[PDB]
Amino acid sequence: YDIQAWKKQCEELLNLIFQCEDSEPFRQPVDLLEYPDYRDIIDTPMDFATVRETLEAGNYESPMELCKDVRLIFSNSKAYTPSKRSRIYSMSLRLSAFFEEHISSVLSDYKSALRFHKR
Numbered sequence: 001y002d003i004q005a006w007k008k009q010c011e012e013l014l015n016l017i018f019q020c021e022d023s024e025p026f027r028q029p030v031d032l033l034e035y036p037d038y039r040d041i042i043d044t045p046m047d048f049a050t051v052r053e054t055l056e057a058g059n060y061e062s063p064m065e066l067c068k069d070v071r072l073i074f075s076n077s078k079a080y081t082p083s084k085r086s087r088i089y090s091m092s093l094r095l096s097a098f099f100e101e102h103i104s105s106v107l108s109d110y111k112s113a114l115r116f117h118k119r
């Protein structure tokens with residue numbers, strides 16, 4: 001019932017994600033001028049370094065907010081892929097599965113802790 005525990009759990013999960021080779025495409029923001037069409041497709045860029053920085057700045061209030069940003073990484077990758085014959089999209093789908101399998105308990109524990117606090 002620790003209301004704050006999600007933060008270190010999310011830091012540890014980001015550490016695992018950064019270690020995963022499947023995160024390579026997503027670790028840093030897209031150079032908009034390198035992939036010049038990117039901002040025509042993607043209204044809100046997101047990447048794992050931004051997520052970590054947001055977390056470390058104390059600018060997430062809940063793991064749900066972090067989750068929303070991580071899921072945006074994946075939706076952006078899907079929106080930008082030209083095909084499934086892309087190593088990047090393939091990596092996004094695997095990393096997404098990994099993230100979702102690991103974030104579920106974080107979310108559950110946090111929401112449980114909040115409920116207990118309000119009981």
Ligand SMILES: C[C@@H]1CN(C(=O)c2cccn2C)CCN1C(=O)NCC1CC1
Nearest residue numbers: 025026028030035046047073076077080
């Ligand atoms: C811009 C695209 C798509 N892409 C993204 O969308 C992205 C970057 C950070 C967060 N996200 C969600 C990944 C990088 N990428 C590439 O094509 N890199 C490999 C190309 C053969 C050279």
